[PDB]
Structure 1
Amino acid sequence: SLCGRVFKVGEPTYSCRDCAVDPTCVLCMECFLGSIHRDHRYRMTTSGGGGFCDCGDTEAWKEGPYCQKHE
Structure 2
Amino acid sequence: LCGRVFKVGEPTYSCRDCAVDPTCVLCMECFLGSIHRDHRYRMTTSGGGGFCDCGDTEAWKEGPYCQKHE
TM-score, structure 2 as length reference = 0.98
Q: Output the aligned Cα RMSD.
A: 0.4
Which ranges in structure 2 are unaligned for 5 or more consecutive residues? none
> CA separation in 2, counterparts of 1:31 and 1:56?
10
Which ranges in structure 1 are unaligned for 5 or more consecutive residues? none
TM-score, structure 1 as length reference = 0.97
> CA separation in 2, counterparts of 1:10 and 1:34?
21
SS in 2 for 1:49: coil
- State the Cα distance separating 1:4 from its structure 2 match: 0.3
Paired residues, number: 70
Matches within 5 A, 1:1-71: 2-71=1-70
> CA separation in 1, counterparts of 2:48 and 2:58?
23
